[PDB]
Specification:
3 copies of one chain form a homotrimer. Chain A has one domain. Chain A is α+β, with helices and mostly antiparallel strands. In chain A, strands 6-2-3-4-18-17-16-10-14 form a 9-stranded antiparallel β-sheet. Chain A has a 5-stranded antiparallel β-sheet with strand order 5-1-7-8-9, covered by helices on one side. In chain A, strands 13-12-11-15 form a 4-stranded antiparallel β-sheet. Chain A is elongated. Helix content of chain A is 16%, strand content 46%. Chain A has 4 helices and 18 strands. The first copy, chain A, starts with a strand and ends with a strand. Chains B, C: GO terms for molecular function: DNA binding; DNA polymerase processivity factor activity.
Chain lengths: 248, 247, 247
């Protein structure tokens, strides 16, 4: 565990990224190499897989001597990261000691000391899955549909056809459909190999999109009775990815 | 029995229904060729509400045959709360027995709302001998009710020739809200005789919860008489509360 | 008739009373012709609090009868939270035992807040040998108190000739806020010798709750001495907390 210094401009954007990921997980092992920071984790129900990739190109300073792996209490990390202001600089620094030093530089110099726990890593791989449908769309639409489907049901059907993406949720007698064509604003891109249907639990969906903003582009990939893969991009270089198991 | 009604400004429409459903729970909407109307009482039969929306405030108004539909107001409120200020609202009914609510904006979002049948009542609004008419900004009204709640649970209205007063007194505390024509918040006053009545704050509070700050509100009342309070939606639709006085 | 005081900007006045009520329950106001003054302790007898409002901050200040009134701060605060930022606040004491509070804006609103008899103790705001003085933005100050609240119950303050340093430590975790004259949030630093003290966060939490981020706070303290926190009210008035230290 050699020392490193990592620096990020915009402490608030970082917090909101960490907060999204932390919605599902509680402890995570961050891999720090000379190429970037990568975190890969499942939530306790072993239904969501989170994968964070922050290449070194999104950091204003990235001094990493030797590749190591630190364990972080995600909720404690978030309580601290939430004190960052939008124009603050975030500095994550480790010395010889077994804690993390999180510093905010702006109107003052605020320094926290975050104790480094140990996390047991699972053999977690991001496999190449045969997704038959791909969908880029505004977070605004996505956040909307999960909130609207929550009014009716616990699960949300996704239905992708050559020219229309559709979410649908059926309750005791109440029903909601959201429908999107390339003629719509919310829909940026739609690639369907074959007509594709699948369903996913709103509870998990609500937590994955909770930290996404109305303005962001989200990519969806999914297949008939296959995982849902949702990802968006951080400073157009970092990537946050969720893999979500279906309802069967 | 199909129809199609289109309203530009989904969020405005919600604010309207949300004002109505503060006191109502279930309503029959009368859909005719001239507009949509609804007349409901609250559970304690203290308040009559009367919503009229002429065809001229809808962008598209296609009604084949006049009809009446009953709506669970609370469910309808929940769905209407999902519209954005720039969405277009579409109220469509096919030959089936539910209500298609649709928001066209960044996406097409469609809800099916089951209809219900509603105990309708000998609901008529006779003209009553009001001796006082006040017109005032909504924020003056919302203020004086929120202020009065701190002291009492009744609000006394008192009109003389050139002063309008709301007064609320408790055991030791007391608040008074005086309005004269010189004040920006009063837009009009007409009093034929000195008028005094009192009304409950619980009901009043709920009547104005959904009223904008800069809305023009009209109050008509009379000594130991009901309080008629109305204000306009888009200058052509009208919302009326009739409120029973206190002893 | 015994006095009439007028203050343009009711919400500004409210926010000031609201600051000094986070610690105080009852208080005696000394109304002289020079201005209004107020000096109270919190129930712990740990924070001394002292408010002074020179008559030059009031648009109208007529005092016939210099006297002293007693006020239930929570009741006063409930009323004062009803003034709008464009309201004119009026305080009238007539012959009787109540304080008439008026908001003049879009309407005339009047409250009668009943006065009370407060066991006014003898409170001297003494002079103390402070060795460190710091001026800084509320934003910094409120953050440090929130930050430090995630770790500990006390907050060390540490002034050296060049840097000001708040520091809170628990069993495992640590926060540390450091300010030099090169930082935008420090505006004045005057240190006579190296100074260190400690204070309860819970009390610091309430003293700053009502302070705006744009505000300018003056800290004076010395080793194991009270903490003196000033912030000014329209440049003429002064609010002053005095905070017994933690050992």
């Amino acid at each position: 565990h050699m020392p490193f210094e990592i620096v990020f401009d915009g402490a608030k954007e970082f917090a909101d990224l960490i907060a999204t990921a932390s919605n599902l997980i509680d402890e995570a092992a961050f891999k720090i190499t000379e190429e970037g920071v990568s975190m890969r984790a499942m939530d306790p129900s072993r239904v969501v897989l989170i994968d964070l990739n922050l290449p070194e190109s999104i950091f204003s300073k990235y001094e990493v001597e030797e590749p190591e792996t630190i364990g972080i209490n995600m909720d404690h990390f978030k309580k601290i990261l939430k004190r960052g202001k939008s124009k603050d600089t975030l500095i994550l620094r480790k010395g010889d000691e077994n804690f993390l030093e999180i510093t905010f530089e702006g109107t003052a110099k605020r320094t926290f000391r975050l104790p480094l726990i140990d996390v047991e890593e699972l053999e977690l791989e991001l496999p190449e899955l045969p997704f038959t449908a791909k969908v880029v769309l505004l977070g605004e639409v996505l956040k909307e549909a999960i909130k609207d489907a929550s009014l009716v049901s616990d699960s949300l059907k996704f239905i992708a056809k050559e020219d229309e993406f559709t979410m649908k949720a059926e309750g005791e007698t109440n029903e909601v459909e959201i429908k999107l064509t390339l003629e719509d604003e919310g829909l940026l891109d739609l690639e369907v190999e074959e007509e594709t249907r699948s369903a996913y639990g709103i509870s998990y969906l609500a937590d994955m999109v909770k930290g996404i903003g109305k303005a962001d582009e989200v990519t969806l990939r999914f297949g008939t009775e296959m995982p849902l893969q949702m990802d968006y991009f951080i400073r157009d270089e970092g990537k946050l990815t969720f893999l979500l198991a279906p309802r069967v």
